[PDB]
């Protein structure tokens, strides 16, 4: 999109741990910026480097530190992690250290989630619900529903795949996941999506519909004691074929 | 040093112009006016910028008041894709960005032919699993959550069937209970009188 | 050349490989308004009026000099590493006001045609070094892209008190001594 | 036997004439003592001065945001700062200290701004004057000598409501 890349996309770690976030600016860009977007404080500027040297500092904590290498890529190191450090970390790049007319190009961000323990991390269960024949006869349209349920955290990407290809027309995913136990601080979530086709499209058994859910969970280097399968980053799907 | 003020939120109608105001009475002769946008949960992205003269570009237009004490971001025709958080930021030489809280813009679609209805959809794998769909209601309808712990109701969601020139609103409700009927699933919500129940 | 009622440099940005060292200042009608102490990250205004009514964010000086450092590196490669030529400076010593025996005055030492902007200006009273009551301006720009520096010495005019202005620059073959006596 | 030195100077200059009416900017990019590129507001584009300039001026002219900032600096720098000078620098008036001390020399010292006129019975035509002396501490100096009754020195400066006269005998 903007030419700025960031790794890792999502990150789950325990309290007291250290994490190192990477950021590759645009080719030719000589300045790098770090921002933190939290629910508590919003979008805040942390630090700016230019030609490998510190150029600007925001209200960054001593346990937060950054660097910019000769290849101009940057690294944000976050030590002695606290639950409050759970945010979105964006990096940006610009040609010069900045001017009143100069654009900043932003990366996709890193979702960092600091937990007390990873024992509450769960993948979702996915299900597809075939269109009501009552809807078909009344509107001459068919809505397919998808239900991603009981996942923790709310780091998921839901997509609809018609005949092996991703679709975006007639699709509607909930903007926010819902809390299954609105009381609990560690509650699992649910997320639903809709895909609406014509009655004659669904009424074709040659048409395949797949609800794909991308789960962002634990690492391969993460330890697991629990006698249930490790909730690693994975894809969970639900499919349905057309009904004549 | 000089900060901006904006409305916390704005609700606009689809296909209608959007005028997002910014206030900055304390602006300096050295300060440029910038607007950035952010969709969830993506990174901010630049829209437009200016100094004194009104600016026009592909994304939007920017109107700066003669005294430079306020400005406006103009979207000439709202789109559902325009719903985002809009930040009016002051820029000077190499000083750092201050995003501030911005304006959460929400765009609402005009539903041309409302056909409110509640349908039941069985699972493609197991027949016994059931979901209710409240769909095709107008944007004036508000979907209230469940007054039950065992029942989950999602918020409204707008889909665009582009080729058909058709948009529709829908919310989904489900439960673990066997006696979970669709005829009484959205009764806590203000469902239209003309709502169809098969 | 350009003619006007007023000429201001907003500002004078200097960065050189020797040190390396930099200078950031603003000038108006040939006089320095302020300079930025690039080590202390502080704006130093040259008049009480300026100190009381004006303000410059030193953060802009530092950022500017950072770009100069980048630019110099590129242009050294482009010029196939062409170094600076050393110029011969012109030193002049004169008093601030008319000389009256037993009345505090100031000896002004003007060093002109400084290039490169690296210089050692010192004072001598009866042949020995003087540090007490000495101060100097920053490097002040010239249209020809050379500089000028002015050095001052507060003194009490007296018989049996000869003064000297010692200038050291690579453009010279030996340290220039500009004498002054009343 | 001398150290190797590579110098770079960036000079952002403003030229003001007839109050706020005429304003012109010139930015100078200098390698050692050689100006290789410049942006003149009257031209309105970066120009290469020496064959060291084409890779920088052509590049800067290809970037809209560079041309827009440099153009707008006439307002964000020159015009902005001239209002700041109007309230301070341009209102600074230091009256000169005038004394005669015997060749009769009239010393006009520590005055601001530069604008000065000094005259010497009736005014004579055989006087040797110093050029305007810039002390560098925001004050000027000028010394007027005269070869060989009452001798009077006449000094005119913007700070004075009436010219200052200093007499001898």
């Amino acid at each position: 999109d903007s030419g700025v890349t960031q790794t890792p996309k999502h990150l789950i770690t325990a309290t007291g741990q250290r994490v190192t976030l990477r950021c590759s600016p645009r080719s030719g860009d000589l300045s790098v910026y770090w921002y933190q977007q939290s629910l508590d404080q919003g979008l805040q500027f942390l630090i700016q480097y230019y030609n490998g040297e510190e150029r600007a500092k925001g209200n960054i904590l001593e346990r937060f530190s950054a660097q910019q290498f000769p290849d101009l890529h940057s690294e944000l190191n976050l030590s002695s992690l606290e639950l409050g450090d759970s945010a979105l970390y964006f990096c940006a790049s610009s040609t010069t250290p900045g001017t009143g007319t100069e654009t900043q190009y932003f990366g996709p961000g890193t979702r960092l989630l600091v937990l007390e323990d990873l024992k509450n991390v769960f993948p979702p269960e996915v299900a597809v619900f075939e269109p009501s024949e009552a809807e078909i006869s009344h509107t001459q349209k068919a809505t397919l529903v998808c239900l991603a349920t009981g996942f923790y955290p709310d780091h998921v990407e839901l997509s609809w795949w018609v005949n092996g290809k991703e679709v975006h027309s007639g699709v509607c995913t909930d903007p926010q996941p819902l809390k299954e136990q609105p009381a609990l601080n560690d509650s699992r979530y649910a997320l639903s999506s809709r895909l609406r086709v014509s009655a004659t499209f669904w009424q074709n058994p040659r048409n395949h519909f797949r609800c794909q859910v991308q789960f962002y969970g634990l690492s391969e280097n993460d330890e697991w004691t629990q006698d249930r399968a490790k909730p690693v980053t994975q894809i969970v799907s639900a499919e349905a074929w057309g009904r004549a | 040093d000089a900060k901006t003020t904006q409305p916390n939120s704005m609700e606009s109608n689809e296909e209608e112009p959007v005028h997002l105001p910014c206030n900055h009475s304390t602006i300096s002769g050295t300060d440029y006016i910038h607007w950035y946008r952010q969709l969830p949960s993506q990174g901010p992205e630049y829209v437009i910028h200016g100094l004194t003269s009104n600016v026009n570009n592909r994304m939007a237009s920017l109107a700066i008041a003669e005294d430079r004490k306020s400005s406006t971001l103009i979207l000439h025709r709202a789109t559902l894709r325009d719903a985002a958080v809009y930040y009016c930021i002051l820029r000077d030489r190499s000083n750092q960005f201050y995003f501030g809280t911005g304006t959460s813009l929400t765009v609402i679609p005009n539903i041309q032919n409302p056909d409110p209805a509640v349908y039941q959809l069985r699972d493609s794998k197991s027949s016994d699993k059931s979901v209710c769909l409240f769909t095709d209601f107008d944007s004036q309808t508000n979907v209230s959550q469940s007054k039950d712990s065992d029942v989950y109701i999602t918020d409204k969601c707008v889909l665009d069937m582009r080729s058909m020139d058709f948009k529709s609103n829908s919310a989904v409700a489900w439960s673990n209970k066997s006696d979970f009927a669709c005829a009484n699933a959205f009764n806590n919500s203000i469902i239209p009188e003309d709502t169809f129940f098969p | 050349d350009i003619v006007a009622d007023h000429v201001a440099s907003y500002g004078v940005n200097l960065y050189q490989s020797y040190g390396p060292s930099g200078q950031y200042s603003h000038e108006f009608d040939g006089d320095e308004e302020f300079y930025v102490d690039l080590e202390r990250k502080e704006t130093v205004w040259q008049l009480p009026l300026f100190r009381r009514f004006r303000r410059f964010d030193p953060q802009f000086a530092l950022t500017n000099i950072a770009v100069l450092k980048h630019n110099l590196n590129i242009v050294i490669k482009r010029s196939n590493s062409t170094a600076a030529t050393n110029e011969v400076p012109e030193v002049t010593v004169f008093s601030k006001s008319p000389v009256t025996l037993g009345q505090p005055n100031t000896l002004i030492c003007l060093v002109d045609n400084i290039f490169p902007p690296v210089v050692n200006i010192t004072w001598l009273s009866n042949g020995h070094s003087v540090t007490e009551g000495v101060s100097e301006t920053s490097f002040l720009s010239k249209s020809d892209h050379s500089f000028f520096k002015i050095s001052y010495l507060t003194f009490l005019p007296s018989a049996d008190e000869i003064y000297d202005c010692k200038v050291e620059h690579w453009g010279l073959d030996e340290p220039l001594l500009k004498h002054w006596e009343p | 036997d001398s150290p190797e030195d590579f110098v770079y100077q960036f000079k952002g200059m403003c030229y003001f004439t007839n109050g706020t009416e005429r304003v012109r900017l010139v930015t100078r990019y200098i390698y050692n003592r050689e100006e290789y590129a410049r942006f003149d507001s009257d031209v309105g584009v970066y120009r290469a001065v020496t064959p060291l300039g084409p890779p920088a001026a052509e590049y800067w002219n290809s970037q809209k945001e560079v041309l827009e900032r440099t153009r707008a600096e006439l307002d964000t720098v020159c015009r902005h700062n001239y209002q700041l000078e109007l309230r301070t620098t341009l209102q600074r008036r230091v009256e000169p200290t005038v004394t005669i001390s015997p060749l009769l020399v009239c010393s006009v010292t520590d005055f601001y701004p530069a604008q000065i006129k000094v005259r010497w019975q009736e005014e004579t035509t055989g006087v040797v004057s110093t050029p305007l002396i810039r002390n560098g501490d925001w004050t000027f100096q000028i010394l007027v000598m005269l070869e060989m009754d009452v001798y009077t020195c006449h000094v005119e400066h913007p700070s004075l409501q009436n010219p200052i006269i200093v007499e001898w005998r």
């Binding site: 030719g28 000589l30 040609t95 010069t96 001017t99 | 040093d1 300096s28 002769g29 050295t30 000077d92 030489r93 190499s94 | 907003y10 500002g11 940005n13 603003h26 009514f53 004006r54 303000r55 410059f56 964010d57 802009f60 000086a61 950022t63 500017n64 770009v67 100069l68 980048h70 630019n71 590129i74 242009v75 | 960036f10 952002g12 900017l25 930015t27 990019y29 970066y46 890779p55 920088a56 590049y59 800067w60 560079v66 900032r69 440099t70 600096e73 964000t76 720098v77 020159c78 902005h80 700062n81 700041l84």
Partner: peptide
């Protein structure tokens, strides 16, 4: 509060 002085910014030489 005193109004901040404006200043020109050097354009950055092409890194490539």
């Amino acid at each position: 509060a005193p109004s901040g002085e404006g200043s020109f910014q050097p354009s950055q030489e092409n890194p490539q």
